[PDB]
Design an enzyme around this catalytic site. Sequence first.
Site, PDB file in Angstrom:
ATOM      1  N   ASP A  39      16.429  52.291  75.058  1.00 47.15           N
ATOM      2  CA  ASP A  39      17.832  51.960  74.730  1.00 47.15           C
ATOM      3  C   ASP A  39      18.141  53.421  74.439  1.00 47.15           C
ATOM      4  OD1 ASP A  39      19.232  48.930  73.057  1.00 47.15           O
ATOM      5  OD2 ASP A  39      20.125  51.357  73.260  1.00 47.15           O
ATOM      6  N   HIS A  69      22.380  52.203  68.475  1.00 51.54           N
ATOM      7  CA  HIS A  69      22.275  50.802  69.231  1.00 51.54           C
ATOM      8  C   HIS A  69      20.478  50.440  69.447  1.00 51.54           C
ATOM      9  CE1 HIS A  69      22.214  48.190  72.785  1.00 51.54           C
ATOM     10  NE2 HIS A  69      23.059  47.574  72.335  1.00 51.54           N
ATOM     11  N   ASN A 161      27.578  41.456  78.431  1.00 50.63           N
ATOM     12  CA  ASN A 161      28.682  40.784  77.480  1.00 50.63           C
ATOM     13  C   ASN A 161      29.734  40.517  78.096  1.00 50.63           C
ATOM     14  OD1 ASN A 161      26.697  41.244  75.374  1.00 50.63           O
ATOM     15  ND2 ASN A 161      27.466  43.420  74.965  1.00 50.63           N
ATOM     16  N   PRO A 175      15.451  38.149  88.916  1.00 54.02           N
ATOM     17  CA  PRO A 175      15.064  36.641  88.676  1.00 54.02           C
ATOM     18  C   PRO A 175      13.637  36.894  87.870  1.00 54.02           C
ATOM     19  CG  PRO A 175      15.805  36.704  91.017  1.00 54.02           C
ATOM     20  CD  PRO A 175      15.440  38.208  90.193  1.00 54.02           C
ATOM     21  N   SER A 224      22.739  42.408  73.770  1.00 54.54           N
ATOM     22  CA  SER A 224      21.762  43.812  73.455  1.00 54.54           C
ATOM     23  C   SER A 224      21.347  42.950  72.128  1.00 54.54           C
ATOM     24  CB  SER A 224      22.703  44.670  73.236  1.00 54.54           C
ATOM     25  OG  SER A 224      23.007  45.276  74.452  1.00 54.54           O
ATOM     26  N   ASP A 260      20.798  22.371  72.052  1.00 54.43           N
ATOM     27  CA  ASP A 260      21.215  22.559  70.822  1.00 54.43           C
ATOM     28  C   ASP A 260      22.624  23.477  71.101  1.00 54.43           C
ATOM     29  OD1 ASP A 260      18.486  23.305  68.435  1.00 54.43           O
ATOM     30  OD2 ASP A 260      19.088  21.468  69.520  1.00 54.43           O
TER      31      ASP A 260
HETATM   32 CA   LIG Z   1      13.957  35.012  84.849  1.00 53.07          CA
HETATM   33 CA   LIG Z   2      18.223  21.115  67.517  1.00 55.35          CA
END
Ligand SMILES: [Ca+2]
Ligand SMILES: [Ca+2]
Length: 279
Positions: A39, A69, A161, A175, A224, A260
Site C-alpha cells: 500500500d 491509506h 470501488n 481468480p 480497501s 446476510d
Molecule cells: Ca478467488
Molecule cells: Ca445472519
Amino acid sequence: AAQTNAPWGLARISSTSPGTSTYYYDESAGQGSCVYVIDTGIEASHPEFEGRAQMVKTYYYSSRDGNGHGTHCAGTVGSRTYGVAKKTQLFGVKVLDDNGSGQYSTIIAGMDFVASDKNNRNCPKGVVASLSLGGGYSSSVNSAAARLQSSGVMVAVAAGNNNADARNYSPASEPSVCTVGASDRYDRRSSFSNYGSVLDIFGPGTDILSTWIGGSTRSISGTSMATPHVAGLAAYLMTLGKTTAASACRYIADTANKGDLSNIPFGTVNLLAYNNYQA
Ligand SMILES: [Ca+2]
Ligand SMILES: [Ca+2]
C-alpha cells in the site's frame, strides 16, 4: 477475548447478525502470523501497532506513509484497537506514492518482493498479503497476484470501488486470490463496492475506523477497508490452525455469514467474513 465498543466492522466479523458492538475473538489474535500490507506504507510508530509493524520495502524516496491509506489498512489488519488480528506481525511494502497511486510495474514488483521476502521472516502461522489497491484489468498484475498466492501467501485484494463487475479490474479479477467486496453496517453491499462472479467474500468497508498517519485515527470507506478485514481474519484463522494460506479464502467463504447481505446482484456471492468465534 472481547473488545467492547469495537469498530462496527470488527463486531460484524464476530457476529452472525449486524448491529452488535463487541468484537469477540480468540486471544491468539493472529500471533505468529505475518501480514504484508502492500500500500502507501505503514506509520509503524503508531502506538496502535505496539511495535508489531515495520516497513520492509519502499519503491519511493521514503518508506514513510505520507498518505494514510496504508496505515489505515494496516490498522484494520492488526492494530490493537482497530485490527482483526491484534497480535499479528505487520510488514509494510510501499508500492503506492503519497497520493495513493502507483504504477502497475511497481505494484507487481511489490508483490514479487513479498513472495521472496517472506522466506526471510519468522512467520510460523503463515503469511498473508493485503492488497487494498487496483486499477483497470491487467493480465500482468493478475499474474503477479497469482504468483504471490502460489508462493504460499494468502493474498486478499480489494474488489474495487466502481460499483461495477470486478472482472474489469486488477488484481481484483485474478481468480486465484481472495477478492473482497465491501459491506456497510446495515449488511448492504457498500454502494461503491464492485461485485461479480470473481468476488470471494465481503467484509466491512463502509465507515471503517482505523489508524491514520500522525498517530491519529479516522473513518473511511472502500473495498480497501474490507480487504484488511479479510486479511486479518485469514491471519487470525491461520494462527488458530483452522486453515492455510492456500485454503484460507475458501475456508472464510465456507464459514462466512451466508445470505446476510442486501443489494447483492445475481451471480455475486452473498458471503460476509465471519470468525465463527465461540467462547
Ligand atoms: Ca478467488
Ligand atoms: Ca445472519
